[PDB]
C-alpha cells in the first residue's frame, strides 16, 4: 500500500502545526524534484451500474467494473492490461477484437469517450517528473479519495476544486489551488518552514482520509 508510511508522514506534518507559526515561509518548502509522474486527471462514478472510470495524466484510461475486475487502456490507444479478481494480469489489444472481453472493452470506450467530450483535464499545466491503476477509492460529501497502486493518494475537493497529490515515496505533497496553480512541497520542509491555513487544514483532512483507507481494510 505504502499507506502506513503516508499516515506517519501526515501525522508528523500535522503534529508540527505548520500554520501556527510567527513567520511562514511556504515557498522555501518547494521541491521540483518531487513533482509526481502520475495523477488522475478525469473520473466518472457510475459504480451503481457500470463502474468507476478514470483517466491518468498520460492520457491512459482505466475502469473498475463492479465484479472487482479492472481494465486499462494505455495511451497508445490499443494496448490493454486486464486485471482479474485474483490479481492475475494479462495483455491484450483492442485491434485484435478479443473474443473474451469485447463487452468490457466497449464499456471502457464509452467511459473514454465520455471523459474526452465532457471533462476538464486536471493538472494539464503540470509537467511530470510502470503505469499505476486505481487500487481503492471512495466519495464523501466534500471530496473523492483516490488511492493509486504506486502508493499515491489523490484527494479532489468538490466545492472549490482544490486538489492534493500525496506521494509516500518522495514524502511529498502537490497542492493545486482554486486558480489551478500548483506547487510541490517536501513534507519535512513544510514541518520546518510552515504553510498557510488553507494547505494545513487540507492536510488534516488528508490524514483522516488515509486513516479511513487503512481502517476499511
Amino acid at each position: 500500500c505504502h499507506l502506513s508510511d503516508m499516515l506517519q508522514q501526515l501525522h508528523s506534518v500535522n503534529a508540527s502545526k505548520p500554520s501556527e507559526r510567527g513567520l511562514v515561509r511556504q515557498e522555501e518548502a518547494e521541491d521540483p524534484a518531487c513533482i509526481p509522474i502520475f495523477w488522475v486527471s478525469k473520473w466518472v462514478d457510475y459504480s451503481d451500474k457500470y463502474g468507476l472510470g478514470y483517466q491518468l495524466c498520460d492520457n491512459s484510461v482505466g475502469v473498475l467494473f463492479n465484479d472487482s475486475t479492472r481494465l486499462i487502456l494505455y495511451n497508445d490507444g490499443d494496448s490493454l492490461q486486464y486485471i482479474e479478481r485474483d490479481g492475475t494480469e494479462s495483455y491484450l489489444t483492442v485491434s485484435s477484437h478479443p473474443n473474451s472481453l469485447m463487452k468490457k472493452i466497449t464499456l471502457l470506450k464509452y467511459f473514454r469517450n465520455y471523459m474526452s467530450e465532457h471533462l476538464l483535464k486536471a493538472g494539464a499545466n503540470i509537467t511530470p517528473r510502470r503505469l499505476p491503476y486505481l487500487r481503492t477509492w471512495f466519495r464523501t460529501r466534500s471530496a473523492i479519495i483516490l488511492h493509486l497502486s504506486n502508493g499515491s493518494v489523490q484527494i479532489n475537493f468538490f466545492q472549490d476544486h482544490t486538489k492534493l497529490i500525496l506521494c509516500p515515496l518522495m514524502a511529498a505533497v502537490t497542492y493545486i489551488d482554486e486558480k489551478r496553480d500548483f506547487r510541490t512541497y517536501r513534507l519535512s520542509l513544510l514541518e520546518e518552514y510552515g504553510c498557510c491555513k488553507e494547505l494545513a487544514s487540507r492536510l488534516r483532512y488528508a490524514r483522516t482520509m488515509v486513516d479511513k483507507l487503512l481502517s476499511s481494510r
Partner: peptide, 6 residues
C-alpha cells in the same frame, strides 16, 4: 457523479 466538466 463525475469530475469537473468543460
Amino acid at each position: 457523479m463525475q469530475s469537473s466538466p468543460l
